[PDB]
Each structure stands twice: as C-alpha cells, then as structure tokens.
Amino acid sequence: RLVKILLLGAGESGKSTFLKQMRIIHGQDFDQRAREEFRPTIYSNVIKGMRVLVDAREKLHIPWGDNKNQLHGDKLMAFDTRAPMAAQGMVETRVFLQYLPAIRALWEDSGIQNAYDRRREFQLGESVKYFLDNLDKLGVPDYIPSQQDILLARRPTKGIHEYDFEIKNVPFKMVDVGGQRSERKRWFECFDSVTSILFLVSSSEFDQVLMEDRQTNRLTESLNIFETIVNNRVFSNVSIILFLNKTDLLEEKVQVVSIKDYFLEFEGDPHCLRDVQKFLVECFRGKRRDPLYHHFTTAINTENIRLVFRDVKDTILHD
Amino acid sequence: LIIGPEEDYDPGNESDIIFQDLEKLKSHPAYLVVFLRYILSQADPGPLLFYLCSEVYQQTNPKDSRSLGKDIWNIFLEKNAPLRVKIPEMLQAEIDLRLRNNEDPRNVLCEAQEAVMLEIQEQINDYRSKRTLGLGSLYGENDLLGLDGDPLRERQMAEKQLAALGDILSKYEEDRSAPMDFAVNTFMSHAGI
Numbered sequence: 001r002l003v004k005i006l007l008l009g010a011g012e013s014g015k016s017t018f019l020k021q022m023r024i025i026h027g028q029d030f031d032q033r034a035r036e037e038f039r040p041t042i043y044s045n046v047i048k049g050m051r052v053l054v055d056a057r058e059k060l061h062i063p064w065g066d067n068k069n070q071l072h073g074d075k076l077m078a079f080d081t082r083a084p085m086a087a088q089g090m091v092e093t094r095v096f097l098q099y100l101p102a103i104r105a106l107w108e109d110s111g112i113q114n115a116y117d118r119r120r121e122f123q124l125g126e127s128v129k130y131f132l133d134n135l136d137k138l139g140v141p142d143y144i145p146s147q148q149d150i151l152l153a154r155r156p157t158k159g160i161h162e163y164d165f166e167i168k169n170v171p172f173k174m175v176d177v178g179g180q181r182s183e184r185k186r187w188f189e190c191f192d193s194v195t196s197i198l199f200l201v202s203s204s205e206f207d208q209v210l211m212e213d214r215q216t217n218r219l220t221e222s223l224n225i226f227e228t229i230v231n232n233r234v235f236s237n238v239s240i241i242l243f244l245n246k247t248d249l250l251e252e253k254v255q256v257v258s259i260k261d262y263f264l265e266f267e268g269d270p271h272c273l274r275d276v277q278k279f280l281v282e283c284f285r286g287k288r289r290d291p292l293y294h295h296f297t298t299a300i301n302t303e304n305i306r307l308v309f310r311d312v313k314d315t316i317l318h319d
Numbered sequence: 320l321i322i323g324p325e326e327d328y329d330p331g332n333e334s335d336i337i338f339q340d341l342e343k344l345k346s347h348p349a350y351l352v353v354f355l356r357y358i359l360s361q362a363d364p365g366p367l368l369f370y371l372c373s374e375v376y377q378q379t380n381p382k383d384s385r386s387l388g389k390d391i392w393n394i395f396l397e398k399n400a401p402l403r404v405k406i407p408e409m410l411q412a413e414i415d416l417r418l419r420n421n422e423d424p425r426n427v428l429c430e431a432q433e434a435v436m437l438e439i440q441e442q443i444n445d446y447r448s449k450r451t452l453g454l455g456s457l458y459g460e461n462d463l464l465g466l467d468g469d470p471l472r473e474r475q476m477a478e479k480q481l482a483a484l485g486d487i488l489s490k491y492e493e494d495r496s497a498p499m500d501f502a503v504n505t506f507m508s509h510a511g512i
C-alpha cells in the first residue's frame with residue numbers, strides 16, 4: 001500500500017536536495033529552528049570552499065588580482081580543516097566572523113575568480129559561489145538560513161535515510177543514500193518493496209571528473225551506474241525515472257564549454273541547451289539492453305520540483 | 320594537486336585477481352556464484368553455462384559422457400536451443416557430425432569453449448567494472464567478506480548462496496530456468512558443492 005521511492009545517482013547529483021523539497025512541498029517544511037541547524041554547515045561550506053580556491057590559485061599558477069591578498073590567502077590556508085568541528089563540516093559563528101573580512105577580499109580578487117572559472121581542473125561545488133555572493137547576509141549577527149540557503153547547503157550523505165509523507169491519503173516513503181563510490185555498498189539493502197527508483201544525474205557534469213579518482217568522467221560514471229541498475233532483472237517490476245538535474249547549471253555551462261570536447265559523438269550546436277539535453281537523453285536510453293521516463297529538473301527550485309513530482313506521482317500510480 | 324572540499328571521504332586485492340581469471344574463479348566456488356549471480360541478473364547466461372557444462376564433459380569418461388554431450392547439444396547448440404550460444408559455423412557443424420556418428424567430440428568441443436571464452440572474458444571485465452563502481456554487494460559479495468584461505472569453508476559458503484539463487488532464476492520462464500538450473504547443478508555437483 002505504501003509507495004516506496006528510492007533515490008539513486010552518483011555523488012552530488014542532487015538526491016538529498018530533492019529529499020528536502022519533499023519536506024517543503026508535502027511535509028512540515030523547515031521552521032526557523034530547523035533552518036538554524038544548517039548555519040554551521042553553510043559557514044563550513046564557505047570557509048573550506050574558499051580554501052580550495054586559494055590552493056587552486058597557487059597550484060594552477062594563476063596571478064593574484066592584487067598580491068596584497070596573499071595575507072588573506074595565508075590566513076585561510078592556516079584554518080585547520082582537520083580539527084574536530086571542522087572535520088564534522090561545521091563552523092561556529094564567532095569563528096566564521098573572524099574569517100569574513102579575509103574571505104570577502106579574496107572573493108573580489110580576479111585571480112580567485114579565475115580559479116573558480118577553472119574549477120573543472122579540481123573539485124568544488126557551485127553552491128560555494130552562491131554563498132560567496134551572499135556574504136552580506138551570512139555576515140549579519142542574527143543570520144537565519146532561508147529555505148533557499150538550506151537547499152543549497154552541501155553535505156555528502158553517509159548511510160541510509162528515509163522520509164515519510166502523505167499526498168491525498170496516499171502514504172509515501174522516500175529513501176536517500178550516498179552516491180559517492182564507497183557509499184554505494186549500502187544500496188543493496190534498500191530495494192525491499194521498492195515501487196520506483198528516481199535516478200538523478202547532474203546534467204552539467206559532462207566536463208568534470210570524479211571526486212573519488214580525479215580521472216573518470218562524471219557523465220561516464222553516471223551512465224555506467226544507470227546501466228547496471230536499469231539492466232538488472234531483479235528490478236524488472238520497478239519503474240525507473242530519469243532526472244536530468246541541474247538544468248539551470250547546464251543552461252549556463254553550454255555557453256562557455258562545449259560537450260563536443262568531452263564526447264565526440266555529439267553532433268549539434270554545443271551552445272544550444274536543447275541539443276545537449278537531447279544528446280544526454282539518447283546516451284542514457286542507449287544503456288538499456290531492450291519506456292524511458294525522464295524529466296529535466298532543477299532540484300533547488302521548489303516550483304520546478306512541485307510540478308515534476310506531480311507528473312512522477314501520476315506515472316508511478318499508473319504503472 | 321589541489322585540496323578537496325570534503326577530505327573526510329573514506330574510499331574504504333586478492334579478490335580482484337580471482338575475479339579476472341575464469342581459471343582460478345572456477346576453483347573458488349563462492350566467487351563463481353557471485354559472478355553467476357551477476358551473469359543471471361545482468362547478461363546472457365548462455366556463454367558461461369555452456370562453458371561450465373562443457374568443462375564437465377571434457378573431464379568425464381568417454382564411457383559415461385554420452386548423455387551429457389547430448390544435453391549440451393540440445394540445450395546450447397541445437398537450432399531451437401533454449402540457451403543457444405553463438406559459435407563458429409564450422410565448429411557447430413563438426414560437433415553435430417561427430418555426435419551423430421558417435422565419434423570423439425572433445426577436441427572440437429574444446430574449440431567451441433575457446434570461442435565462447437571471448438564473450439565470457441567480456442562479461443568478466445564488465446563485472447570488474449561494476450566492482451570498481453563499488454556495486455559488488457548488489458551481487459552478493461558480502462558473503463566473501465569473511466572467507467579464509469580454506470577450500471572446505473568455501474564450498475560450504477557455495478551451497479548457501481547457491482540456494483539463494485532461486486530469486487533470480489524465478490525471474491525466468493520455465494523454458495529457460497529449467498535448463499539453466501540443470502546447467503548450474505551439473506557444474507556445482509562436479510565441483511563438489
């Protein structure tokens with residue numbers, strides 16, 4: 001009777017963000033207290049993210065916009081990311097405020113900006129840019145993360161997590177799991193009584209490599225995982241739905257990067273969003289060895305997810 | 320290099336070596352069943368099953384192998400075989416000719432096994448990529464996360480994973496599950512499981 005939905009996908013595909021949306025759209029949402037619990041994670045995202053940027057600036061030999069910022073760069077690299085709290089991906093407010101001036105100056109530096117634009121050469125999520133562009137509101141003494149901030153807050157998932165909700169007298173149980181390699185060993189425990197699998201893919205990852213081994217192409221990894229799930233006879237009765245997520249990022253990326261440089265078989269306009277999306281869908285459809293439900297989503301956009309899940313629900317409830 | 324933003328990540332050897340060579344994979348029943356589980360769920364079971372049954376025929380006295388050879392033919396080579404396997408036209412013709420005239424089919428059967436080995440090695444490489452994806456547990460690898468270098472202990476585990484295979488064979492229609500079961504048992508029983 002319960003509709004059990006399993007969220008699968010490689011690391012950083014948006015699974016946990018989608019899960020937060022279900023709570024926002026069909027659950028109790030996030031009140032002020034629940035949102036304040038994300039503040040330490042947000043401050044950690046910013047400090048660790050900026051540290052990645054200065055390290056990248058130095059190692060990629062990118063000139064400083066102003067070398068007086070070297071003093072700020074030193075202060076940030078000196079922040080110990082291995083200490084107890086930082087290790088848990090948390091930063092106290094008083095600590096954050098001590099680094100705010102240095103972080104603000106660094107973000108305005110053209111060398112740091114150049115490093116960010118070349119992030120494909122290392123590992124860094126775009127949500128870091130979102131928070132760096134909102135340092136003014138994060139810096140206020142009584143900052144309380146907004147719903148949008150909570151959706152962008154980043155933390156890699158470990159273990160299995162469930163969230164239950166109801167839609168018009170219909171009970172749902174959604175399962176979230178970690179997508180990075182070492183966490184996939186937990187997937188086998190989540191398929192009991194599964195009604196549907198929502199397979200998430202970061203549509204904007206075609207020019208990136210894995211965090212696990214900075215060599216394998218991220219899109220290639222997603223295709224290979226999808227291939228093993230969709231062709232497993234054990235899931236013959238389970239409906240699989242593909243989400244080409246981060247559509248918003250893909251729209252902005254196709255204007256500065258050509259997918260053709262990473263996937264030769266692409267034959268269309270690299271600067272055209274629809275041409276690339278069609279290519280991505282073809283790639284996944286081709287992994288199935290004899291109906292591919294799919295949606296272009298933006299997990300951080302509540303309105304987009306509200307309407308996408310409406311279609312997903314109808315699809316699942318009719319299979 | 321450039322530091323990462325989530326250094327707390329934990330990535331979490333003998334196994335690899337075993338899974339890459341059918342030769343030593345066949346000598347490790349517990350490992351073979353994991354591969355069998357992979358094949359039955361993700362690919363064409365024909366190649367591996369034909370190979371294993373043929374292995375038994377090759378190791379059986381010509382005086383007790385008549386019926387087995389007939390079963391292999393009807394199951395994997397016959398025109399309308401349930402688990403038909405692809406092999407060179409020359410070999411299939413030669414095998415049929417020697418079986419119909421009661422000659423020694425071992426040499427040509429061996430050549431058919433080598434032909435199928437191409438496909439089997441491909442499936443082996445595919446599974447190795449799944450292990451790289453960190454998805455080995457989906458095919459029962461946890462059952463090997465405790466085995467010691469001991470034959471009896473392994474063949475012991477073999478018959479427990481082997482019993483649990485029914486869940487995958489049930490996803491098949493009688494016209495295929497029946498012959499597959501017969502194939503598995505023929506090898507396992509000869510392996511001492």
Ligand SMILES: Nc1nc2c(ncn2[C@@H]2O[C@H](COP(=O)(O)OP(=O)(O)OP(O)(O)=S)[C@@H](O)[C@H]2O)c(=O)[nH]1
Pocket residue numbers: 009010011012013014015016017018125126127151152153154155156157158177178179180245246247248249297298299300301
């Ligand atoms: N711009 C944009 N950001 C997104 C979208 N979906 C998720 N994100 C952001 O991507 C980052 C990673 O997403 P997250 O939800 O943690 O992925 P995950 O699949 O759960 O990752 P893991 O647990 O397997 S490692 C987060 O900062 C999140 O806010 C999207 O559609 N557009």
Ligand SMILES: [Mg+2]
Pocket residue numbers: 015016017155156157176177178179
């Ligand atoms: Mg997650």
